[PDB]
Design an enzyme around this catalytic site. Structure first.
Site, PDB file in Angstrom:
ATOM      1  N   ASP B 139     -50.778  86.213  -9.766  1.00  0.00           N
ATOM      2  CA  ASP B 139     -49.649  87.369  -9.978  1.00  0.00           C
ATOM      3  C   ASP B 139     -48.286  86.897 -10.298  1.00  0.00           C
ATOM      4  OD1 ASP B 139     -48.846  89.921 -10.095  1.00  0.00           O
ATOM      5  OD2 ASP B 139     -49.937  90.570  -8.035  1.00  0.00           O
ATOM      6  N   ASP B 200     -50.950  98.087 -13.750  1.00  0.00           N
ATOM      7  CA  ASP B 200     -51.889  98.153 -12.688  1.00  0.00           C
ATOM      8  C   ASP B 200     -52.669  99.544 -12.341  1.00  0.00           C
ATOM      9  OD1 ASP B 200     -50.220  96.367 -11.478  1.00  0.00           O
ATOM     10  OD2 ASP B 200     -50.660  96.890  -9.266  1.00  0.00           O
TER      11      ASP B 200
END
Ligand SMILES: *[C@@H]1O[C@H](CO)[C@@H](O[C@@H]2O[C@H](CO)[C@@H](O[C@@H]3O[C@H](CO[C@H]4O[C@H](CO)[C@@H](O)[C@H](O)[C@@H]4O)[C@@H](O)[C@H](O[C@H]4O[C@H](CO)[C@@H](O)[C@H](O)[C@@H]4O)[C@@H]3O)[C@H](O)[C@H]2NC(C)=O)[C@H](O)[C@H]1NC(C)=O
Ligand SMILES: *[C@@H]1O[C@H](CO)[C@@H](O[C@@H]2O[C@H](CO)[C@@H](O[C@@H]3O[C@H](CO[C@H]4O[C@H](CO)[C@@H](O)[C@H](O)[C@@H]4O)[C@@H](O)[C@H](O[C@H]4O[C@H](CO)[C@@H](O)[C@H](O)[C@@H]4O)[C@@H]3O)[C@H](O)[C@H]2NC(C)=O)[C@H](O)[C@H]1NC(C)=O
Ligand SMILES: *[C@@H]1O[C@H](CO)[C@@H](O[C@@H]2O[C@H](CO)[C@@H](O[C@@H]3O[C@H](CO)[C@@H](O)[C@H](O)[C@@H]3O)[C@H](O)[C@H]2NC(C)=O)[C@H](O)[C@H]1NC(C)=O
Ligand SMILES: *[C@@H]1O[C@H](CO[C@@H]2O[C@@H](C)[C@@H](O)[C@@H](O)[C@@H]2O)[C@@H](O[C@@H]2O[C@H](CO)[C@@H](O)[C@H](O)[C@H]2NC(C)=O)[C@H](O)[C@H]1NC(C)=O
Ligand SMILES: *[C@@H]1O[C@H](CO)[C@@H](O)[C@H](O)[C@H]1NC(C)=O
Ligand SMILES: *[C@@H]1O[C@H](CO)[C@@H](O)[C@H](O)[C@H]1NC(C)=O
Ligand SMILES: OC[C@H]1O[C@@H](O)[C@H](O)[C@@H](O)[C@@H]1O
Ligand SMILES: OC[C@H]1O[C@H](O)[C@H](O)[C@@H](O)[C@@H]1O
Ligand SMILES: OC[C@H]1O[C@H](O)[C@H](O)[C@@H](O)[C@@H]1O
Ligand SMILES: OC[C@H]1O[C@H](O)[C@H](O)[C@@H](O)[C@@H]1O
Lengths: 400, 388
Positions: B139, B200
Site C-alpha cells: 500500500d 477501494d
C-alpha cells in the site's frame, strides 16, 4: 381526505414498478399488462396470506386504456382486457380484495395513453364508480400547474359526488417540487387520501436512499401532515425484485413502516421467495405500520459512525426504533441507551426485535445496550413500557 | 513483472473488505484479524472446493503488525498471531495454498500500523521471504510521490534478490490518480504483477458501478497494458457479503471476468450461501477468467436502452460476451446479432450461457437472437466457432 377510508396506510399491490408498460402479450403473455395478470395476482393475494395479513388493494397502473368510446367513456384495451373492468372488479371483490385504477390529470398518461383532461374529470369519476373501483391514482403528466390546481380538487369533488367511497391517491405535489409554498399540504390533506411527494422509485438501493434522504431533509414539514386518512407516499416497495439485497429489502420495509408509508408492493407474487414473503408478511411490522394513531416517524439521531436512528410513536405509549446503517464496510456494534435517544422519565422498557422475535428486557433510560447492524441494513425494535404487559391483563369488563 | 508468476490473474481470498481492521478479539473472537481467522479460512478453502477450483491465495491485509524488534525486524501482533507468521505460512502451504501479506510504502499503513519506509524496504523483503510468504500487497499511505517512485521499484528489486518468487501487488497508481501522465503503465508492468488503479471497493452496487465506469471510461489506456504477469486490479469481489443483490453478484463476477481481473474474494467462507458459492465456483467462468492469452476485454457497445455489451477474446478463437443492463426498471429483451457486435463473417458459432449452461447452436453473423437481461444484471455467453 374525510371519506372514511385509509384510517391506516393502504396496503396492497401495484403493477407499475415490476411490470411497467409491457403490452407485448403476443411475445410475453405471462408478464404483460392484462386482465390475466391481475386475476392471477388476485388469486395469489387470496391464497398466499397477503389478504389475511392486510394487503387488500390490487391496483392497475398506466397502460390499461384502449381509448374512449363514441360517448367519451374510457374503455380498457379490448385485446388485453377482453371481459372489461366491471368483470375484473367483480372478480377481485369475490376474493375479498379491492380494485385500484389509474388515470392522468392532463392530456395523456405519462406513457401516452388517453388523459383525463378537465372536461373529462366528472365523466371518468362516474365511470370508475360505475365499474365499482375502490381506489384511484391520479398522475399529473402532460398538464400545466393551473390545470393541476383546478383538476385535483375537481376530481376529489367528482369522486365524492358519485356516492361511492374511492380512495384517492394524488401525484400533484411531486410535479410541484413537493414543498411549500408551491405545495399546500393543508389542501392536499383535505382532498386526497395519499400523495406522492417526490421522485418515482426505481429498482436500486440508490433510489431508496435518495427518497429516504429527501423525506428526512424535509421531515419538519412532512412529518406533521400525515395521519389517519391522509398519508405521505414515498412510493412502492421494491421487495421481491432485482435491485435490493436481503439487508436492503429488510431496511426498506422497516423504514417505510417507521414513516407510516403505504405498503404497496410491486413484484411477481407468483414467484416471490419465502425470504421476501417473510419480510412483507411480518405480523409485528404490519401492526406497527398500521398503528391506529397514524403518527409518522422521524430520524432522531445521526452519528459520525453513519448509524441513523428513527423513532415512530405508537399506541399505548409504545415506540418503534429503527437503527439503520449507512456504512458500506461490515457489521457494526452500535452502543447507545434510551436516555441518549431522548427517552426521559422513570419508565422501564422491554423491546422485541421485529425481525428476530427476540425480547430484550429491563431497559431503563441509563441502561447501555449494543445492537449489531449490517451494512445497508437495520435493526428494528418494538419498544414498550414493561407495565404495558400488566395493564393489558388487568382490564375489567362489564356487559352493556 | 517478469518473475514467472501470475501468468493468469490471481485467485484467492483477502481479509480486508469483509473483516477490515477488527482487532477486538476479546469481544469478537470469530471475526477479528487473527491467526485463527486465517487458519479457519484456509481450512474452508481446502475443504469446500475453493483451492481445487483455482482459489489458491490466502492474503493478510492491514492491521496484522505488532511492531519492530530491537533489530528493526517486523513482528505480527503477539496477542492475535501468537505462533507467528512462519507458522501460518507453513500451515497454509500444508493445505496446498499460498500466503499473502501486506505492507505499506510509507511511514504507516493506512490504519496507522508500522510502515515500510525506504530504509526498511530490503529488510522487510528479506523478512517476508524468510517467512515463506508468496505474495505481497504494498500500500502507499503516508508517503510522498517521490518516496513511492523510489520505493515501489526498490521493493520489486529487493523481493527478487531474496530468490523467493513473491507475487507483487502494487497500490502505487491509485495514489497518483490512476492515469497518465502521472502514472506510467509500461513502468508498472515492469515492476508489478498487478496494481490497484483506482478507489477501494465498498460493499455497495454504487461502488461497483463507480469502478466499472472508471475502467470503461479509460479502457483505451487500461486494456492494452494488461497481460500475463501484469494485471489491472479493480479490487475485491463483494460476492457473499451484504450490499449486492443476486443479479448484482452475478454481474460483478461476469464483469471482473471479462476485464481479466483478479478474483480475490473477501467474504466469510464459513457461512457463505450455496447461491453465492455457485457464482464464485462456476467452472466456465473461471476458465474464462484464467484464459491463457490474458487479453483484457472491453465494452464494445452501449445502447440508448442502457444495455452495454462487453467482449473478451479468448484462446482457440473463442470469445466471452457480457450483456449488462444498467436499467433499473424490469427485465429487458435485448435484440441483436453477432454481425451487429462486429463478429467475423462466414463463421458459424455455438454459445454457452455461462450461468444457465444452456447451449445456443448454429449462430451465423446475420442470425437474430434475443437475450433477457434483468436490471443491474447480466447474460454471459462463451462463444466459439463450430463445424455444423
Ligand atoms: C363526501 O365528503 C363528505 C365530507 O364533506 C364525506 O362525509 C364524511 O364522511 C365521513 C366518513 O363516513 C364521516 O365520518 C364518520 O362520521 C360518523 C358519524 O359521526 C357523526 O356524529 C358526530 C357527533 O359528534 C359528528 O360530529 C359527525 O359530524 C357525524 O355527523 C362516525 O361514526 C365515523 O367514525 C368512524 O371512525 C371511528 C374512529 O374514531 C370509528 O370508531 C367508527 O367505527 C367509524 O369507522 C366517521 O367519523 C363524516 O362525518 C362525514 N362528514 C360530513 C361533514 O358529513 C363523505 O363521506 C364523502 N363521500 C364520498 C362518497 O366520498
Ligand atoms: C528476478 O528477476 C529476474 C530478471 O527479471 C527473473 O529472471 C527472469 O525469469 C523469467 C521467468 O522465469 C524468464 O522468462 C522466461 O525466459 C525463458 C527463456 O529465456 C531465455 O532467453 C532470454 C533472452 O531471450 C534469456 O534472458 C534467458 O536467460 C533465457 O536463456 C522463456 O522460455 C519463458 O517463456 C515463457 O513465456 C512465453 C511467452 O511469454 C511462453 O511461450 C513460454 O511457454 C514460457 O511460459 C520466459 O520468458 C526470464 O528470461 C528471466 N530473465 C533473466 C535475465 O534471467 C527472475 O525470475 C526473478 N527471480 C525472482 C525470485 O523473482
Ligand atoms: C515520515 O516520518 C518522518 C520522520 O518522522 C517525518 O519527518 C519529520 O516530520 C516531523 C513532523 O512534521 C518534523 O517535526 C516538525 O519539524 C518542524 C520544523 O520546524 C517543527 O516546527 C515542528 O514542531 C516539528 O518538530 C521533523 O522535523 C521531521 N523529521 C525528519 C528527520 O525529517 C515525515 O514528515 C513523515 N513523512 C510523511 C510523508 O508522512
Ligand atoms: C395539452 O393539449 C392542448 C391542446 O392542444 C394539443 O396539444 C398541442 C401540443 C398540439 O399537438 C395540438 O394539436 C393538440 O390539440 C395544448 O394546448 C395548445 O398549446 C399550444 C402550445 O403548445 C398552443 O399554441 C395552443 O393554442 C393550445 N391549443 C388549444 C386548443 O388550447 C396544451 O399546451 C397541452 N398541454 C400540455 C401540458 O402538454
Ligand atoms: C455506559 O457506558 C459508559 C462508558 O461508555 C459508562 O461510563 C456508563 O457508566 C455506562 N452506564 C451504565 C448505566 O452502566
Ligand atoms: C433480423 O431482424 C430484422 C428486424 O429488426 C430484419 O430486418 C432482418 O431481416 C432479420 N434478419 C434475419 C437474418 O432474419
Ligand atoms: O464511516 C463508515 C465508513 O468507514 C470507512 O472506513 C469504510 O471504508 C466505509 O465503507 C464505511 O462506510
Ligand atoms: O438482517 C437483519 C436482521 O438479522 C437478524 O434477524 C437480526 O437478529 C436482526 O436484529 C436484524 O435486523
Ligand atoms: O431507459 C431505461 C429507464 O427507463 C425508464 O426511465 C425507467 O424509469 C428506468 O428505471 C429505466 O432504467
Ligand atoms: O440471474 C441472471 C441469469 O439468470 C439465469 O441463469 C439466466 O438463464 C441467465 O441467462 C442469466 O444470466
Amino acid at each position: 381526505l374525510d371519506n372514511g377510508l385509509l384510517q391506516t396506510p393502504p396496503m396492497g399491490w401495484l403493477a407499475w414498478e415490476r411490470f411497467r408498460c409491457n403490452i407485448n402479450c403476443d411475445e410475453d403473455p405471462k408478464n404483460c399488462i392484462s386482465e390475466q395478470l391481475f386475476m392471477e395476482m388476485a388469486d395469489r393475494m387470496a391464497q398466499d396470506g397477503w389478504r389475511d395479513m392486510g394487503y387488500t388493494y390490487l391496483n392497475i397502473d398506466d397502460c390499461w386504456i384502449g381509448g374512449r368510446d363514441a360517448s367519451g367513456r374510457l374503455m380498457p384495451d379490448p385485446k388485453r382486457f377482453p371481459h372489461g373492468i366491471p368483470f375484473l372488479a367483480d372478480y377481485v371483490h369475490s376474493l375479498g380484495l379491492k380494485l385500484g385504477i389509474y388515470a392522468d390529470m392532463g392530456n395523456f398518461t405519462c406513457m401516452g395513453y388517453p388523459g383525463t383532461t378537465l372536461d373529462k374529470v366528472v365523466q371518468d369519476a362516474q365511470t370508475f364508480a360505475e365499474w365499482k373501483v375502490d381506489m384511484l391514482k391520479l398522475d399529473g403528466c402532460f398538464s400545466t400547474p393551473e390545470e393541476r390546481a383546478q383538476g385535483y380538487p375537481k376530481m376529489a369533488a367528482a369522486l365524492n359526488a358519485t356516492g361511492r367511497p374511492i380512495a384517492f391517491s394524488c401525484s400533484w405535489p411531486a410535479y410541484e417540487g413537493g414543498l411549500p409554498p408551491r405545495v399546500q399540504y393543508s389542501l392536499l390533506a383535505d382532498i386526497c387520501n395519499l400523495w406522492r411527494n417526490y421522485d418515482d422509485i426505481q429498482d436500486s438501493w440508490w433510489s431508496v436512499l435518495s427518497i429516504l434522504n429527501w423525506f428526512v431533509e424535509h421531515q419538519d414539514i412532512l412529518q406533521p401532515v400525515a395521519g389517519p386518512g391522509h398519508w405521505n407516499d414515498p412510493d412502492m416497495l421494491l421487495i421481491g425484485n432485482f435491485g435490493l439485497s436481503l439487508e436492503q429489502s429488510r431496511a426498506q420495509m422497516a423504514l417505510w413502516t417507521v414513516l407510516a408509508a403505504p405498503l404497496l408492493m410491486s413484484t411477481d407474487l407468483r414467484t416471490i421467495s419465502a425470504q421476501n414473503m417473510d419480510i412483507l408478511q411480518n405480523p409485528l411490522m404490519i401492526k406497527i405500520n398500521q398503528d391506529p394513531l397514524g403518527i409518522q416517524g422521524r430520524r432522531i439521531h445521526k452519528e459520525k459512525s453513519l448509524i441513523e436512528v428513527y423513532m415512530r410513536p405508537l399506541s399505548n405509549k409504545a415506540s418503534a426504533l429503527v437503527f439503520f446503517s449507512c456504512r458500506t464496510d461490515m457489521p457494526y456494534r452500535y452502543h447507545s441507551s434510551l436516555g441518549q435517544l431522548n427517552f426521559t422519565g422513570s419508565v422501564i422498557y422491554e423491546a422485541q426485535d421485529v425481525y428476530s422475535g427476540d425480547i430484550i428486557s429491563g431497559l431503563r433510560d441509563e441502561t447501555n445496550f449494543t445492537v449489531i447492524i449490517n451494512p445497508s441494513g437495520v435493526v428494528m425494535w418494538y419498544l414498550y413500557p414493561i407495565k404495558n404487559l400488566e395493564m393489558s391483563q388487568q382490564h375489567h369488563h362489564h356487559h352493556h
